[PDB]
Motif scaffolding. Structure first.
Motif, PDB file in Angstrom:
ATOM      1  N   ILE A 209       0.635  -0.940  -0.075  1.00 38.31           N
ATOM      2  CA  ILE A 209       0.004  -0.069  -0.064  1.00 38.31           C
ATOM      3  C   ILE A 209       0.822   1.308   0.034  1.00 38.31           C
ATOM      4  CG2 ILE A 209      -1.837   1.110   1.341  1.00 38.31           C
ATOM      5  CD1 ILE A 209      -2.710  -1.483   2.611  1.00 38.31           C
ATOM      6  N   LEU A 210       0.703   2.099  -1.219  1.00 36.83           N
ATOM      7  CA  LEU A 210       1.364   3.197  -1.421  1.00 36.83           C
ATOM      8  C   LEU A 210       0.958   4.471  -0.560  1.00 36.83           C
ATOM      9  CD1 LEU A 210       2.376   2.894  -4.792  1.00 36.83           C
ATOM     10  CD2 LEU A 210       3.902   2.414  -3.181  1.00 36.83           C
ATOM     11  N   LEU A 211       1.850   5.181   0.314  1.00 34.94           N
ATOM     12  CA  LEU A 211       1.194   6.114   1.250  1.00 34.94           C
ATOM     13  C   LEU A 211       1.962   7.248   1.149  1.00 34.94           C
ATOM     14  CD1 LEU A 211       0.954   3.712   4.425  1.00 34.94           C
ATOM     15  CD2 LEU A 211      -1.061   4.929   3.182  1.00 34.94           C
ATOM     16  N   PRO A 212       1.964   7.951  -0.181  1.00 34.34           N
ATOM     17  CA  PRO A 212       2.653   9.192  -0.446  1.00 34.34           C
ATOM     18  C   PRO A 212       2.344  10.477   0.691  1.00 34.34           C
ATOM     19  CG  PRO A 212       1.032   9.109  -2.007  1.00 34.34           C
ATOM     20  CD  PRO A 212       1.058   7.561  -1.092  1.00 34.34           C
ATOM     21  N   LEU A 213       2.854  10.768   1.453  1.00 32.25           N
ATOM     22  CA  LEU A 213       2.713  11.638   2.503  1.00 32.25           C
ATOM     23  C   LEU A 213       2.341  13.248   1.829  1.00 32.25           C
ATOM     24  CD1 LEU A 213       5.112  10.932   5.250  1.00 32.25           C
ATOM     25  CD2 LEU A 213       2.664  10.423   5.064  1.00 32.25           C
ATOM     26  N   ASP A 214       2.747  13.644   0.440  1.00 30.22           N
ATOM     27  CA  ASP A 214       2.255  14.431  -0.148  1.00 30.22           C
ATOM     28  C   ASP A 214       0.822  14.496  -0.407  1.00 30.22           C
ATOM     29  OD1 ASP A 214       2.484  13.163  -2.741  1.00 30.22           O
ATOM     30  OD2 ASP A 214       4.162  14.183  -3.455  1.00 30.22           O
ATOM     31  N   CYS A 215       0.318  13.283  -0.477  1.00 36.49           N
ATOM     32  CA  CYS A 215      -1.070  12.929  -0.996  1.00 36.49           C
ATOM     33  C   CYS A 215      -1.511  13.131  -2.517  1.00 36.49           C
ATOM     34  CB  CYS A 215      -1.981  13.874   0.065  1.00 36.49           C
ATOM     35  SG  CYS A 215      -2.142  13.615   1.598  1.00 36.49           S
ATOM     36  N   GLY A 216      -0.187  12.952  -3.130  1.00 34.22           N
ATOM     37  CA  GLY A 216      -0.460  12.741  -4.778  1.00 34.22           C
ATOM     38  C   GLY A 216      -0.823  11.354  -5.008  1.00 34.22           C
ATOM     39  N   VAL A 217      -1.894  10.957  -5.520  1.00 36.50           N
ATOM     40  CA  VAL A 217      -2.419   9.807  -5.933  1.00 36.50           C
ATOM     41  C   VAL A 217      -2.602   9.599  -7.400  1.00 36.50           C
ATOM     42  CG1 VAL A 217      -4.134   7.984  -5.442  1.00 36.50           C
ATOM     43  CG2 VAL A 217      -3.171   9.154  -3.469  1.00 36.50           C
ATOM     44  N   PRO A 218      -1.772   9.511  -8.105  1.00 35.94           N
ATOM     45  CA  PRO A 218      -1.993   9.159  -9.560  1.00 35.94           C
ATOM     46  C   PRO A 218      -2.942   8.070 -10.176  1.00 35.94           C
ATOM     47  CG  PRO A 218       0.306   8.679  -9.154  1.00 35.94           C
ATOM     48  CD  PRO A 218      -0.474   9.279  -7.859  1.00 35.94           C
ATOM     49  N   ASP A 219      -3.373   7.985 -10.977  1.00 36.14           N
ATOM     50  CA  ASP A 219      -4.147   6.532 -11.331  1.00 36.14           C
ATOM     51  C   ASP A 219      -3.275   5.547 -11.988  1.00 36.14           C
ATOM     52  OD1 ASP A 219      -6.514   7.254  -9.954  1.00 36.14           O
ATOM     53  OD2 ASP A 219      -6.915   8.588 -11.840  1.00 36.14           O
ATOM     54  N   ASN A 220      -2.086   5.997 -12.763  1.00 33.96           N
ATOM     55  CA  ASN A 220      -1.368   5.011 -13.538  1.00 33.96           C
ATOM     56  C   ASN A 220       0.161   4.985 -12.834  1.00 33.96           C
ATOM     57  OD1 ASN A 220       0.892   4.335 -15.596  1.00 33.96           O
ATOM     58  ND2 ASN A 220      -0.985   4.144 -16.917  1.00 33.96           N
ATOM     59  N   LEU A 221       0.607   3.858 -12.393  1.00 32.88           N
ATOM     60  CA  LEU A 221       1.897   3.809 -11.505  1.00 32.88           C
ATOM     61  C   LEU A 221       3.059   3.744 -12.667  1.00 32.88           C
ATOM     62  CD1 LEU A 221       1.101   1.085  -8.954  1.00 32.88           C
ATOM     63  CD2 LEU A 221       2.177   3.225  -8.799  1.00 32.88           C
TER      64      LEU A 221
END
Ligand SMILES: COc1cc2sc(C(=O)CCC(=O)O)cc2cc1OCCOc1c(OC)cc2sc(C(=O)CCC(=O)O)cc2c1F
Lengths: 173, 178
Positions: free
Chosen positions: A42-54
Motif C-alpha cells: 500500500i503506497l502512502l505518499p505523504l504529499d497525498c499525490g495519488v496518480p491513477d497510473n503507476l
C-alpha cells in the motif's frame, strides 16, 4: 480528526474485507504461472499525490497483470468487485520483484479537501493529517494479525525512485 | 471531525467517479438488458442512509418488499494503480401489495458502517453514544457537497431515516414518487 476517521474507514470498509482473501488469490495466480510476492503493498505518499497510473510515477514499475477478482455482496451491491493489479519492479533493466500494489485512496481525499474551500481544511495541515492517517492505519493493523500479515505500508516523502522505495520493503521479506 | 471527513471521502473517492457515468449505464440497461416487458429502471443512485448506522449486505433481508432484479453493466476505470477498478451497482424492484411499484439502483452509504464499528472498538476513541450525531453530520455534509456538484446531485438521491414496524421499501418509494 479527519485522518483518524479515514484510516478507520479504509480498514473497516476495505482492508478488513480483502486482506483475509488475498493470500488465496495470489497463490491461485502463481499456481497458474518468478512468483508474485505475497501481501498488498500500500503506497502512502505523504504529499497525498495519488496518480491513477503507476508506470507514469516511475517507469521502473510496469503493469504485469490483474490478479483474479474477488466478489462479495456488500451493502446492497450484489457481487461488489475487488480488483487489484500486479506490477513488476525493475532495477537497472532487470526484474527485481513482482507484487500487488496500489495507493491508499483516502490520501487523495486529504488532497481534495485541501483544494476545496468548503472542506474547511488547509494545505498547511495536510502533511500532519497524512502522517496521522498512516500512523492510525499502522495502529489498527497491529490488532488485526491476518490483515497485518497480508499488507505492507509504504510511506514516503519526495524532496525520487518509487520502485526503489517498494523494493527496499520487498527486500526486508 | 470523523463524519465530515467520511462524507468528503465518500464523495471524492466514490460518488464523484461513478455519478457522471451512471445515466449512460442505466440507459444501456433499459435499452439492451432490461426485460422487454418491464418498466424502465429509474435514473439516479438511491443512497440508503440509516441513521442507526446498521448496514446489512443483503437488502431483501432488511425488507422482503425489496427484491433484487439485476446488476447494472459494470463501470471500469484505472484508479490509484488498480487497472480497470470495477464499480458494480444493483437494481431492485420495490413491491407494494404484492405488485411492482418501482425499480431503482440502490445501496447503502458504506461509511455509516465505519461509524458503527468505531462506536464498538475501544481503540477508535469514538464513544458509543456519538453514533447518531455523527450519522446526521455525515448526511448533512454529503447534502452540502452535492449542492455544489450539479451532475452528481441530479444523479443521486439521499434516503436518510430513523426506525422507531418500519418499511424500508415505503421509505424508498416515497422518494422515488417525488
Ligand atoms: C466505507 O469506507 C471506505 C471504503 C472503501 S472501498 C475502497 C477501495 O475499494 C479501494 C479502491 C478505491 O478507492 O476505489 C477504499 C475505501 C475507503 C473507505 O473509507 C473512506 C471513505 O471514503 C470512501 C473512499 O475513500 C477513498 C473510497 C470508496 S470506494 C467505495 C465503494 O466502492 C462503495 C462500496 C464499498 O464501500 O465497498 C466507497 C468509498 C468510500 F466511502
Amino acid at each position: 480528526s479527519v485522518a483518524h476517521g479515514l484510516a478507520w474507514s479504509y480498514y473497516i470498509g476495505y482492508l478488513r474485507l480483502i486482506l483475509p482473501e488475498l493470500q488465496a488469490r495470489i497463490r491461485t495466480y502463481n499456481q497458474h504461472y518468478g512468483a508474485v510476492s505475497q501481501r498488498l503493498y500500500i503506497l502512502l505518499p505523504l504529499d497525498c499525490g495519488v496518480p491513477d497510473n503507476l508506470s507514469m510515477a516511475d517507469p521502473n514499475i510496469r503493469f504485469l497483470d490483474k490478479l483474479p477478482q474477488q466478489t462479495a455482496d456488500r451493502a446492497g451491491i450484489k457481487d461488489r468487485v475487488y480488483s487489484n493489479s500486479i506490477y513488476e519492479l525493475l532495477e537497472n533493466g532487470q526484474r527485481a520483484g513482482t507484487c500487488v500494489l496500489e495507493y491508499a485512496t483516502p490520501l487523495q481525499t486529504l488532497f481534495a479537501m485541501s483544494q476545496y474551500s468548503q472542506a474547511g481544511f488547509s494545505r498547511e495541515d495536510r502533511l500532519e493529517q497524512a502522517k496521522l492517517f498512516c500512523q492510525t492505519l499502522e495502529d489498527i493493523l497491529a490488532d488485526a494479525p491476518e490483515s497485518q500479515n497480508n499488507c505492507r505500508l509504504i510511506a514516503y516523502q519526495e524532496p525520487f525512485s518509487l520502485s526503489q522505495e517498494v523494493l527496499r520493503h520487498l527486500r526486508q521479506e
